[model samples]
Target chain A: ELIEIREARMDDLDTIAKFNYNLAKETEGKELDMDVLTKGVKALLLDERKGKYHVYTVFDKVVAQIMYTYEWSDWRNGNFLWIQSVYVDKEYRRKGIFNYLFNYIKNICDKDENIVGMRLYVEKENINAKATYESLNMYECDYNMYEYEVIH
Target chain B: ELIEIREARMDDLDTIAKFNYNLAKETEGKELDMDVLTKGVKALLLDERKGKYHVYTVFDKVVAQIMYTYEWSDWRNGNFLWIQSVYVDKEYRRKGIFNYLFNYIKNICDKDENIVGMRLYVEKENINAKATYESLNMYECDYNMYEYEVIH
Candidate 1:
C-alpha cells in the first residue's frame, strides 16, 4: 500500500471543500453552507498568510486532509499552529491515514524554528477523537475556549 | 478619568512588551525571555498580517493592551479573531480598561463583514477572567483545547 502526504494544491480545492463539509456534518452535526465553505477553502489556498492544507493520498486519490492557521504568540516570540478542518474519508478510517497526515505537519514544525507549537480544539464530547490525539502525544491543556459571535 | 482605545504604534513597543512580560509572570507564573518578547512585539507592530495590538491609554500613557491574530474558518467563510496577550497595568485594573478595549474591537467586528467572531482561551482556573469574559457575553464553547509542543 503506497501512501503520499503532500501540500494541497489548487486543483484539490473541490475535494478539500467537500471533505470540510462532510467533516462538520459528521462531527458536529452541523450542515455547513457549501458556498461559504468552497470560497473559504479557496481563499486559504490562494493566501499563504491565511493558512495551508495538506492531504494524504492513496493511489492518487485524496483520502484524508488537515489544515492549520497561524497564531502569533508574543509571549513565546513564535507562532502556534492552530490545527483545524481535519477530516478522513469514511472509507479511509482505521487505516492510519490521519497518523501520516499529522506526523507530516509535526515533522515540519520540528524543523521550523519559527513554529513553536501546535494546538487544536475538539468538541469535549468526542471521546474517540480525544483518544486518537492523546495516542499522538497531544495533551489536553488547561485552557477553556470561549467565543462571542459578532455575526452569526 | 478619560480613557482612549486605539491601535498600537511602533513607539508603544516598549510598554507593550513589558505588559506581555508582566502578563505571563502574573497570570501563568512563567517568565518570558525579554529579548524574544521585545522582538516579537516589534514584528507584530511592523506586520499587520501577523496580528495587531490595541491599547487603552490614559493621559498619553499606555495602561492596558490587547492583541489578536486571525484564524481562517472555512465553515464560516470568514476569519475568527483569536484574542491573546491581554494585560492591564495593576494600577489600572479596577477601572474598566479591558471593557473599553474589548468593545473597541467588538465594534470593528460588527462593521467588518469578513470577520465572523471573536475567541479567546483562558486558563481554567482564572475565575475572575472567566467572569469578566462572560459579562461581555462570551460563552464557553464546547471545545477542549489540546497542544503539542514541538519546541520548548
Candidate 2:
C-alpha cells in the first residue's frame, strides 16, 4: 500500500476537475457544468496566488485531490489554509487516501511560520465525513456559518 | 439622521484600520498590533482583487465599517463574499448601521452574476450579534467549522 502525494501541476487539471465534478455529485447531488468547471480549474491552475492543488496517487492514478486556498485570520493574526475540492476516487474510499493528503498539507503548514491552521466546511447531512474529520484531529468549531444571498 | 454608505477609498484606510482594531478589542477582547493591522488594511485598500471595505458615515464622520473577501464555492460554482471586520461605532449602535452596509453588499452581489452570497463567521458567545444577523435574514447553519493547525 504505497501512496505518493504531491503538488498538482497543469497536467493534472482534467483529473482535478473530474474529482470536483464527482465530489459535487456525491455530496450535493448536482451535476456541475464541465464548461464552467474546466475554465475555473484552469484559472486557478495558472495562478498560484489563487490557490494550490495536491493530488494523491497509487500507481500513477490520481486516487485523491485536494485544493488549498489561503485566507487571513485576524483573530489569529496569520494566514490559514482552507481545504476545498476534496475528493477520493470512489474505488479508493476508506483506504486512508485523504489522510495522506491531509497529512501532506499539515506538513506544509508546519514549515510555514505564518500559516496558522486549516479550515473547511462540510455539508450538514454528511455524517460519515464529519466523523472522519473528527478522527483526523479536527474538531467541531463553535461558530455558525451565516449567509445572505443576493442571487440565491 | 443623515447617513452615507459607500465603498472605502484610499483615504479611508486609517479609519478602517482603527475600526478593525476596535472590532478586535470589542469582539475577541484582543489587542491587535496597529502596525500590522494598518499594513493589512492598506494592502487591501490598494488591491481590488484582495478585498473591499465599505464604510458608513454620519455627516462626514466615519462611523461603521465592513470588509469582505472573496471565496469560491464549488457547490454553487461561483464566488461568494465573506464578511469580516464588521464594526459600528459606539455612538452609532442601534441605528441600523449594519443593515445599510449589509444591504449595500447584497445589492452589489445582485448585479454580479458570479457573486453568489455573503458569509460571515461569528463567535459562539456573541448572541446579540447573532440575533442581529438573524434579523437581517441570515440564519444559523447546521455545519460547524473544523480546523487543524500546521503552525499554531
Candidate 3:
C-alpha cells in the first residue's frame, strides 16, 4: 500500500474528529463529547499560532493523524512540540503509518532550530506504542509529572 | 510570614517574567531573553482564554507563581491541568509556599468536575520537590514522557 503523510486542512476536521473518537474508544475505553471535540479540534485547525495537525493517508483516506501543541523550555531556549490527539485507524495498525508520520515531524523539527524537541504522554499499559517510540529513538526522560487543575 | 496566593493580574507581568528568568537560571543553568519572557508572560496575562496563572505573594510582594496549561485526557474525558513555570523566590525556600499553592489548586480541582486530574514534569534529580509531591498524595505514574519540537 502506498502511504502518504501531509499537513491537515480545514476540510479534514470531520475525518480527524471521527478518528479522534475512535482512538479514544479503542485506547481508553471512553466516550467523548463529540460537540466539544469537534469544536476543540477546529479551534486548533483554524489558529496557526495555537498548533498544527497533520494527517497520514493511504489512497486518499486518512488512516492516522496527530496534533502538535507548543511548550516553551528555557533550558533548551526553545519550544517543545507536544504530540497530542494521536489516533491511527485500527485497520491501518502495523502498517508503519505512525513511523511515516513521525519521520515527517522529525524532519520539520530538525529543520527548525527553534524547536528544541518533542514530548507526549502515553498510557502506561500501552506497551506496544512505547516500544514503537523506543524504536524511533525517543526514550523515557527523568522528569516526574505533576499537575494543579481547575474544574473547567 | 503571611503569604497570599491569588490569580495573577496584569501588573504582575514583570514579576512573573523575572521569576521565570530565575527559574531557568536556577534549574537549568541557562539565561533567558528577558524581553521575550516578559512578552510571553504578558500575552497569557492579557488573554484569559490562554489559561491562567496564580501568584504567591508575601507582604504584598510577588514571591512565587505557577502557570497552568490545559491538557485533555481522553481516558478521563476531561481537561488535565499541566503545571508549568513553577518557581518560588530564593528567600522563600522551604517555607511551605508550594504546599499552599498545591492545596489551592487541589481545592479547585475537587470542586470542578470538568477537571479530571493534574500533571507536571519535574527533573529526575529534584528529589526534594518530588518528595514534597509524594507527601501531597500525588503518585508517580507509570507512563513515560516523549517529545518532538520545532523552532519558534
Give the number of the best model, judged by TM-score: 1
Q: Is candidate 2 or candidate 3 better by lDDT?
A: 2
What are the candidates' individual DockQ scores?
A: 0.75, 0.53, 0.35
Which candidate achieves the best lDDT against the true structure?
1
Worst 10 residues of 1 chain B by lDDT: B143-152
Fnat scores for every prediction: 0.85, 0.55, 0.43
Provide the TM-score for each candidate, comma-separated.
0.93, 0.87, 0.76
Better of 1 and 3 by lDDT: 1
Count of clashes, each model: 0, 0, 16
TM-score (chain A only) of candidate 3: 0.88
TM (chain A), candidate 2:
0.88
Cα lDDT of model 2 by residue, B24-85, tens digit: 88778889898878877887777666668888988888999988877765445567788876
Could you tell me which 10 consecutive residues in candidate 3 chain B have the lowest summed lDDT? B70-79
Residue range A1-152, candidate 3, lDDT tens digits: 56677788999989988988888888877687898788777766777656688998878888889777766543344556777767778888887777778877777788887677878877777858767787877777777676543445
TM-score, chain A, per candidate? 0.92, 0.88, 0.88
Cα lDDT tens digits for candidate 3, B1-152: 66678899999988888888888888788788887778678767776645678999878889889887665543344556667767888898898887788877778788878777887787878858767787877767667687542334
The models' CA-based lDDT, in order, is 0.88, 0.79, 0.75
